[model samples]
Target: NPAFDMKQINALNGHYQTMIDNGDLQCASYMMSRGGEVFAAESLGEFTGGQKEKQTFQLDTIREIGALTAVFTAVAVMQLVEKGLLDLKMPVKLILPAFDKPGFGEIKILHLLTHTAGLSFELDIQKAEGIDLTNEEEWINYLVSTPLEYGVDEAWNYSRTGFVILGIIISKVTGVSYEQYVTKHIIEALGLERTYFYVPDTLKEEVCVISEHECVQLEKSHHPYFPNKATSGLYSSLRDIWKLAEMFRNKGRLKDKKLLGRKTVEAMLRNQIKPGLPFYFFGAPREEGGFGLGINLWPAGDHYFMTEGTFSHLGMGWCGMFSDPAEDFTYVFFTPISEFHPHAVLTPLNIVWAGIELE
Candidate 1:
């Protein structure tokens, strides 16, 4: 643990405390680790629950990790690929018969993984009548019937609908539900005990409820009402999130177990996007940055403040899970407020990176 300065680490926590006291921030938690060992972790701030009592954020507080779940889905897809059950270059219509329409044949599994499938950002559930939005099959049906915004492999739009389709494809090919496949193969395979598709009543009290209204929304996500569980529906703790990062940082190994092949992990970390397309998310162009299979390739620059090979995924702008394989360090953070802020992510990141005194 001497690799980090405790003075700087505690100062990072104090930074959050100041924001909490100033009412500019709400409940949040973060953890950092090196070589699979935790060095610094902290949780602070409080919010009123349904009982009208104050509940402080704890390290074990279960929070909904938005797009972070896409990584899990990507893992499952790659696992199937390793088993020779799914081919990344094969056309998707071969497995999902619903996508056999025009302008869809060129879309392949690799396109889905790399966000080059030219699919829409999400399915418009309201536009499709007589379809159950809560049902995964119905959701996929709606998405497939819809038109693509661009030609296959023509551009990137960070398609959530693409991953949702991948989830359903995994189920159709494996003969089990997507949740069961992930829980059995990826989650249980890695021994991630705190991750869940649905939190039982036993652990319901531990769910972080930032606001009374958000609590209602969080509870509903556990049920069938939310369609894209593969894209955004997972509740996990800071501890387990770090373990997931460690697996990737260690290049697909957990302890002595080889969860994924080394070559697969390498391919995942390498940039898959091509060179000549305009890529933008939230109106900002990611000209410097690139994307791997299901992860974000952090651009190596003085402005980014990290090593060259850093890859990460953020959940709803409030949760950040980063794995700097070059430095062998991982950072996981969560805040209940969903509003977007750059400093909330970078400030702690800089503080932690600044505290690293030794390799």
Candidate 2:
């Protein structure tokens, strides 16, 4: 993306290490890359809040990447769409016989992909139905029995339940596990090694720890999403996700292999959401944000993290990555912590990207 130099990284690290010293962040790691070349990477602070840790944050420690897992699932869904096995405008109940519901007959696959299907989160549905999340069969049975909330594309609220449905579709269409599909199509195609739906048995204890939200446990593999949970089970390090971002940076191709067609990538960044929907903020002033297929659209930004029309996903529990096709650079960052404050994450992000010259 540049003749961008190394010293800019040094300036950001000094600032983040100070944040650690100030107890602003428990533990964190930040990585910057343009294409395949990593420009800077730094890890600061220890593990979060009384994790019985025999480990500390390291350059290679992978952590549960939270809902960023949705990105991969979306890619698989679109690939199926490309092959004519799925149609974006087709009602999902037509494909998955058991996906039946009263109003879902009016809901297209696009509605769920864009979070405009107007259903509750899957976890909320599971608990209300008295089905354990561990009870996958019974949980799916109850979930599909439920109808959508009557908004087709008129409204938007983020929903984990939508992506979970996509996972089942992928498994059914491909005749393989969702984990296997993403592994072959995205991970192997892009040469990403650190990504995992579940960390391996021996290395399970070694993944980074997250303490902030028990509801969204982003630690290694402990949170019932083993094998694969489509909403939020991915684990990867800086080296891995940068490649994922780079493929998108290159219009969904790495060298000769197009993980997705250039047009498909364009379609993903296109706005499927309404004009005035609100961006999420934990406690800060909520501003308007938009959505495309599975990614958050940056129609414009006043922050250092992104600019106009940037497609990216950021998460709680020390996970975020975004690509700027205009700048042709991608940034991946992580921190393993419990109560991460807004300013704590944003200040360093602002200062770091402030130095980036987007020509």
- List the candidates' TM-scores in order: 0.93, 0.85
Worst 10-residue lDDT window, candidate 2: 277-286
Best candidate (score: TM-score): 1
> Which pairs clash in model 1?
none
Return the TM-score for candidate 1, rounded to 2 decimals: 0.93
- Per-candidate local distance difference test: 0.80, 0.70
**Model 2 TM-score on a 0 to 1 scale:** 0.85
lDDT, candidate 1, 1-359, per-residue tens: 53777888788888888888888787778898877788778898886664567777889888788889999999999999899999899898898777788888788999999888887676665688788877866766777678888898777778887888888889889999888998898888888878898887788788876666656665563444346478888888888788888888888888975678989989998989888876756435556467898888864445766787888887773797887876777889987665676667657777777776667
lDDT of 2 by residue, 1-359 (tens): 55464566776777767777887666778777654567777887676434565357787877777788888888889988888888888887776666566666676789889887776554443345455554445656666566654366655667777888788778877898888899888877778777877667676555766554542454434346322577777878877777777777777787777888889888988788777654333223345666788887753476545667778876656577777666666777886555556655555566565666744
Q: List candidate 1 segments past 4 Å from native.
A: 217-228, 299-302
